[PDB]
């Protein structure tokens, strides 16, 4: 019963994550690039610093990873393998974390109320800062869920262990890349 609860939370929070990144891209980002409003010269044309590679991270989870996790729904003891298979893709998070301080610093110094105004007009409960922290949260959450599965899976602990090893290495490498 417990492993079914863990797998259900993995899938539900994955869907929520994809939805959140989608909302960030189609609101806060679309406003900068649409050419529909007025952007401060301090951030004009600097969307790649503000958002990093969050487009690429979204494409991976939307196009590939949520669909592959879904295929593991009735195979929770094997889901560690999903992370082994797509290990290379998670390297994008290293690039994302490295850039995060510059993003925050640029928004604070030159963005003014531009993104706050955008939030009000769309009635979003989450600020741009609340959205941009989510990849940092997500890449450190997968290891917790894999550890939980290890407490209640007899077979096959082997598959889970290899997956966990991957999802400890990725955030460690991202951590060690910070200046």
């Amino acid at each position: 019963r417990k492993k079914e609860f863990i797998m259900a939370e993995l899938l539900q929070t994955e869907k929520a994550y994809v939805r959140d990144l989608h909302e960030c891209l189609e609101t806060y980002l679309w406003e900068m690039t649409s050419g529909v409003e007025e952007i401060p010269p301090g951030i004009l044309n600097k969307e790649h610093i503000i958002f990093g590679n969050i487009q690429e991270i979204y494409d991976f989870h939307n196009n590939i990873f949520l669909k592959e996790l879904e295929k593991y729904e009735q195979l929770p003891e094997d889901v560690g393998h999903c992370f082994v298979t797509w290990a290379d893709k998670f390297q994008m998070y290293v690039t994302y974390c490295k850039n995060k301080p510059d993003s925050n610093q640029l928004i604070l110094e030159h963005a003014g109320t531009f993104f706050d105004e955008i939030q009000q007009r769309h009635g979003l409960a989450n600020s741009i800062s609340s959205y941009l922290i989510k990849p940092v949260q997500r890449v450190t959450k997968y290891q917790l869920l894999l550890k939980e599965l290890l407490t209640c899976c007899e077979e096959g602990k082997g598959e889970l262990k290899d997956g966990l090893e991957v999802m400890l290495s990725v955030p460690k490498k991202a951590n060690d890349a910070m200046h």
Binding site: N126, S130, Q143, K172, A174
Partner: protein
């Protein structure tokens, strides 16, 4: 409307995620304790004043010292948490959490929170600590630690029974108003 960003920090398994779930849903999650608490916002009334309270969890980041501070900029108030039946989590308030929070956020108020209050008088818990030559953290230890780190309040609570739970978040808002 006044907006408030509150970040919850502290050792693994001091019950950060439980604290947040129990508060926002008004019930301990007994059937299954979720691993994930997504960033939360809600209008709340405190002393006739309307406020929007934002809550961010940090569970899962305890081992990544350079990733953790990415959540800290523009925080209005911190809850630094330890479990009342884990002396190691209490010492880490001084060794780990206060130093990094104050380094990144020099002017931001801190509330020191002791969690799992329901276990302090639990026979089996006490006995297991005894086997390790330890005892639970009592109120005057909490007060002393808060004075050391310059916390504006020390508060004890239980996510399980909800005793003291609403008061923690009321006082976090009062630290900012």
């Amino acid at each position: 409307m006044q907006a408030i960003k509150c970040v919850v920090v502290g050792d693994g398994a001091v019950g950060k995620t439980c604290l947040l779930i129990s508060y926002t849903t008004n019930a301990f999650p007994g059937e299954y304790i979720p691993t994930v608490f997504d960033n939360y916002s809600a209008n709340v009334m405190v002393d006739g004043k309307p406020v929007n309270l934002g809550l961010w969890d940090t569970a899962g980041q305890e081992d990544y010292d350079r990733l953790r501070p990415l959540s800290y900029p523009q925080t209005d108030v911190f809850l630094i948490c330890f479990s009342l039946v884990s002396p190691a989590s209490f010492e880490n308030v001084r060794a780990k959490w206060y130093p990094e929070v104050r380094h990144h956020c020099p002017n931001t108020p801190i509330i020191l929170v002791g969690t799992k209050l329901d276990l302090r008088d639990d026979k089996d818990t006490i006995e297991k600590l005894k086997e390790k030559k330890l005892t639970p953290i009592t109120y005057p230890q909490g007060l002393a630690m808060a004075k050391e780190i310059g916390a504006v309040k020390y508060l004890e609570c239980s996510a399980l029974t909800q005793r003291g739970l609403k008061t923690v978040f009321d006082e976090a808002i009062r630290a900012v108003l």
